[PDB]
């Protein structure tokens, strides 16, 4: 493999969710890539530390289709497998119209609602998280 030139972190990574006991992390479109690292760091922090002020994390992923972000499904799978304190609750919202579904979206739909799970995990992805189809109800969820 060729060698890379790396310019260090420019993020200036506010971690304000640690300031709150309960936090809701909302990701949309391409603005969901950092949440993989965020969730992995959160689950590691809650695994190594006991009295973490952040008692519960809600990760609301909102996307049209999971194309180019299928790796995020595996990352969420490993995060929920390593979530030994039920810190992270993941909710995926596929907002694609039913007529414009691709093969992956239809497979997700049928495995979520037209096919029984095995260990409460969908046969397609393997996530204990529930995947929804439509606009996420932010107001009723917050209520």
């Amino acid at each position: 493999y060729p060698k890379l030139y790396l310019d260090g972190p420019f993020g200036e990574g506010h971690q304000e969710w640690h300031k709150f006991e309960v936090s809701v992390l909302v990701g949309g479109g391409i603005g969901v890539t950092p949440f993989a690292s965020i969730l992995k760091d959160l689950v590691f922090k809650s695994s190594v530390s006991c009295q973490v002020f952040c008692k519960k994390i809600y990760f609301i992923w909102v996307t049209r289709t999971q194309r180019q972000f299928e790796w995020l499904a595996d990352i969420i799978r490993e995060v929920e497998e390593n979530d030994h304190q039920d810190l992270v609750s993941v909710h995926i919202y596929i907002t694609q119209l039913a007529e414009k579904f691709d093969l992956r979206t239809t497979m997700l739909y049928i495995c979520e609602r037209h096919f029984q799970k095995v260990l409460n995990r969908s046969l397609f992805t393997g996530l204990r998280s529930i995947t929804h189809f439509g606009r996420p109800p932010f107001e009723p969820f917050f209520n």
Binding site: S89, Y93, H132, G134, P136, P137, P140, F141
Partner: peptide, 7 residues
């Protein structure tokens, strides 16, 4: 309980 139900 959580009311997670898409429109």
């Amino acid at each position: 309980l959580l009311f997670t139900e898409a429109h």
